[PDB]
């Protein structure tokens, strides 16, 4: 079955018929850092080689129009750049200058102002281009989405009874010793619907409660946590029994958002649970054990669940039993 | 008619009679990065050329006061900077030094401490100025407002019935495959008012509810979303019928705020719906279709709406019909 | 009278008897960027001059222990660094190397590995020190608190009647065309108190409501806004009449927090209203006027207020009149 | 007794049996900046020395395959790099080039394109590697967790009566004159539990209320603040008397999260109070005193508490006395 979101977090959507494609060029920086690495590294190589060529020809051109080329056998003549024997030497000086290596076998001189104003322009644009590209690299290396790689979601969501309440539970973890700051968990139920009046709504998102009113959706996440959605009157699973579950066409999107401790930058880790990955009547297997001075987590057991005695009834039907029980 | 906010997000306000203009110089960095590009690139060129000139004259000056200029025919004499034949050579050494190209035809020496302490000062201020300016460039290129270019708002807001409730709806979209992290939507109604007591309040902002109490204002925005404001008792559209709408003098400001995935930086995309852009009795045309392995969006249809059967009554009058219907 | 917070935002508190002062050295970066500019620029100059000296002596030392110094009249002998005639030349090479100007009159050679491993160490530490310091500069220039300079608070808070409710109002503004993203306003009442049991609490902070439950504390701030605190049953001004106000010993701290549009960084602008700056029975003078295509703000009038007819009674006593009025 | 969180903020947990260790390499930047300094500085040294060697051999190799090595006695022959007498000179040119010191005793030439395309590759990768590493340093120096060093938590939590309510109180402070922006305090109670149905939950986190519904959890923190948790019906200390406290097996985790004023980056300071550090019947000793123009804090007294008359009863039992008192 098709899902909206993959277990690893990527989203199965393509944006077609974007009539106004120039917008991608309007915020070029976003397109650049969003590219695949091969394409950054390609552009990176190109941006540098074309500038050095582009200036290299302008350095050659000053030397040509000046007549430096024509008098190389005459020492009386002095050029813009000492030693520009040909079209190759210009390329090298062009790099020697803009990288600011400037070996100084090729050296500029007093004799032309035409050259000085180029060295000037170059150095300036050399800084602006170099910023743009190095900046682009730094951002791409340091970007926070990468942290998501050391944030795990449990492979299944489970439904079982907890202190008399029927609960939907998934487990989350963080493989690093460092932290997710201002950590928080939110969850969205994704399923299509139809209004009384006729409107079909493709992949309708309804927020699932996972601590919003108590601030228990704000996580302190060191050892793995089991996030619990209590299936109450206000739940979208209120009228879903063990029987009905597999015949429902729904998907739970789970989103973990906080700041990578070292870069202040906010990360978003995502995963999905489709109807078949929601185990009814199950419990997560413990992972925590005590050792001398430290609590040790056993990630082998992180995804593992086991079965428990659990009603087949919808949460709603459990209430109906309770209403008669308290009234008895 | 005059609007407060343009559809593209820019705001029609000018800040006149700012008596204390020095404040703009107090936080210079904000003024700089807020400038138009022509003016950054201008200042950028200028800041660099004046330093190189300013030092170039000081390099010339040491050479003049020392008497290096007077003895160029004497090799016994050795200068601060080998080869400073005139006022031009000094400018070149000044750049050769501060860019740190340092071709080394112009080379400093032991003979003057006067020169060494300059090379010292220069290099230090060369780093501080270079930071300030390159930094200023980097910030301006990477700034998040730019993302707003690949965030679209629907061209109209529509009002129609949804599961028995009258709703104001606008649609939002994101043209990129990358994400808006900690995405959230808020909306402000802008219209003037008068208190019982007499006070006129120019462009009074009252927050429009778009999910605040359920956290459904926190968006997971991949494919386009239709943001719904339920027009209930607490709504500012409670007493507005189809008839009255066009004769109201109001404007809805819509604000999308989240973090650009790659730079942790927060973006704010804005748009406005003036009274004439609010289509009563309309529905948004679907955009989502299924393809092999991927959900495809059709942005051609993004802004498109169609008409449906919809009451001409205000939400309030619909309730009055319901009160008698339930009491019947 | 002593205030806790100045009108410009600075806080009248000193942190004395910090026994564990090393902590300031533990997070050195915070102390550095928190310093006055004179002291950054001082340290900046020093950090660079001591490294260049420190290496300069090590460059001199290799040259001394090797015996390069003793043979300068012998060309057969070749040194670590060509041309190190004395203790001054070493300082210059040391800079020429670490700034990477490297004029190359002073050039390293094959003949000693002792020199190569220094050039190596230097270049590496040259990058680490240069990062630390340039970074420190960049941060300090770009820091967001500076924006606060172009965020104004009204000079007074006023109390007057608004649609039958008694309200405490202050006005806020933003002098720039650019934005404060995720803008929000919160306000704290600061006054001492005593518990029934005996405990004196020095400067007790109680949050003042300014939109928290409706999200109207989240500002869209283009033209100036009048922030309104409705003085209701839950207000700390519930039992304060015009008469009692000046004899109360209290201070309202007002805090504006949002993100500078260009740097994603969060700014905090603060101000205070002491009991004497709270004008009872007053209204803010309008500032907004319409011009062709643009709304123009008149900051001359920003702080200005005028008097209106307003009850001398506490909000509580107004309710008591209303209770008998509705019961009549 | 074992705690979950240390008083200084570090967490007693180890992540064992991480089967998928490659993920650490997938987001390498996080692993790098998370390393101990010795290991950054080690890698930093290594990354640079291996590139310079790696290129140095390629520079040597071009010189070898070309036959430059074989003709050093022939001036007719001209090499890729003037002066590459051996395997050592190549290493030096390799650094001279990539650091961009380029002393220019070793200079590239026209004669080989083989060399030019290397200089090209090098300079490009020289920028990418240099970014990666300097960036990594900058991040690590500027990271916000460090601020936590100048944020103190009181050594004990105390329980005493405040205006008729039994309260759990701890005190927090900030040693710097600079601010924590968007400051906020949250607190989690950590103790194991067992569901009716059988499920043991290892270290169950239940959020402790410390201002969430009034926004008094949002701190304006200049002088020290006493954070108060009112022990009401909804409290986890509702049924805990002075008698029972020490026999409970619980731990309160306290978390302070806000932005370092200068870097926009968010900091998280943590501490813990185990059952024995919760003083029943105690009050914090004042720290604030007035001086000419400034409020002075006395951090000697910051942690100090003193005893007061305080009920031995649980908050619940105090209510039961009140129920009969009001009914009397
Ligand atoms: C030369 O090869 C470049 C090498 C591999 O990168 P390569 O060219 O295969 O492209 C990367 C690849 O597509 C990953 O799958 C992407 O990660 P994710 O799956 O989208 O997370 C990644 O995007 P982002 O996620 O890095 O933007 C892409 O850049 O990386 C250095
Ligand atoms: C040489 O030309 C510079 C070239 C065009 O820029 P130019 O000088 O026309 O100035 C830009 C122009 O005014 C845009 O309309 C602005 O974008 P927006 O409409 O305000 O979004 C932009 O401001 P910001 O938005 O970039 O601050 C301005 O910088 O850009 C490289
Ligand atoms: C050479 O002079 C340096 C020159 C003036 O700076 P100076 O040395 O007088 O020191 C600044 C001065 O104390 C300001 O009042 C401070 O601003 P604020 O009043 O605290 O806002 C500022 O602190 P921050 O606010 O910049 O940290 C201080 O750095 O600035 C370039
Ligand atoms: C050469 O020595 C390097 C020197 C000391 O650092 P060293 O190598 O001892 O390693 C640091 C040490 O382990 C600290 O205890 C850590 O701080 P915290 O206790 O974990 O806060 C710190 O980690 P982080 O906290 O900096 O990541 C470690 O880097 O630092 C310059
Ligand atoms: C004219 C400008 C055209 C290029 C604009 O920049 C372009 O952005 C789009 C959207 O992220 C990317 O589009 C990419 O993902 C989409 C899914 O939405 C694929 O259908 C497409 O084949 C792929 O190239 C391009 O890889 C990138 O090059
Ligand atoms: C003395 C210092 C004066 C310069 C201060 O910096 C200045 O800031 C203001 C406000 O953003 C900008 O002002 C700009 O927008 C305003 C609208 O508010 C226009 O009316 C004005 O014509 C235009 O220049 C200037 O372009 C900029 O140069
Ligand atoms: C041993 C290390 C001592 C230096 C520690 O770093 C130090 O931090 C404190 C607190 O911000 C600063 O202290 C500064 O403000 C305090 C107010 O709290 C003043 O009373 C003090 O005279 C002033 O120097 C110092 O200017 C700074 O140098
Ligand atoms: C194959 C790749 C293996 C290396 C991966 O990177 C590795 O990350 C883990 C988790 O933070 C660190 O692990 C570190 O803390 C854990 C606690 O969880 C200790 O038990 C371990 O002895 C210590 O090395 C390593 O110091 C680091 O080198
Ligand atoms: K250089
Ligand atoms: K150089
Ligand atoms: K050089
Ligand atoms: K040189
Ligand atoms: K936030
Ligand atoms: Na962790
Ligand atoms: Na998207
Ligand atoms: Na503004
Ligand atoms: Na402080």
UniProtKB/TrEMBL annotation, chains A, B, C, D:
The record marks 130 as: Role in the control of polyamine-mediated channel gating and in the blocking by intracellular magnesium. It catalyses: K(+)(in) = K(+)(out). Keywords: Ion channel, Ion transport, Membrane, Phosphoprotein, Potassium, Potassium transport, Transmembrane, Transmembrane helix, Transport, Voltage-gated channel. GO terms for molecular function: G-protein activated inward rectifier potassium channel activity. It is a multi-pass membrane protein. Residues 5-144 form the Potassium channel inwardly rectifying transmembrane domain. It is found in: Membrane. One of its GO terms (cellular component) is inward rectifier potassium channel complex. The chain crosses the membrane at residues 41-65, 115-139. Residues 151-320 form the Inward rectifier potassium channel C-terminal domain. Belongs to the inward rectifier-type potassium channel (TC 1.A.2.1) family. KCNJ6 subfamily. This is G protein-activated inward rectifier potassium channel 2. It comes from Mus musculus. The lineage of its organism: Eukaryota, Metazoa, Chordata, Craniata, Vertebrata. The chain holds residues 55 to 380 of 414 of the full protein.
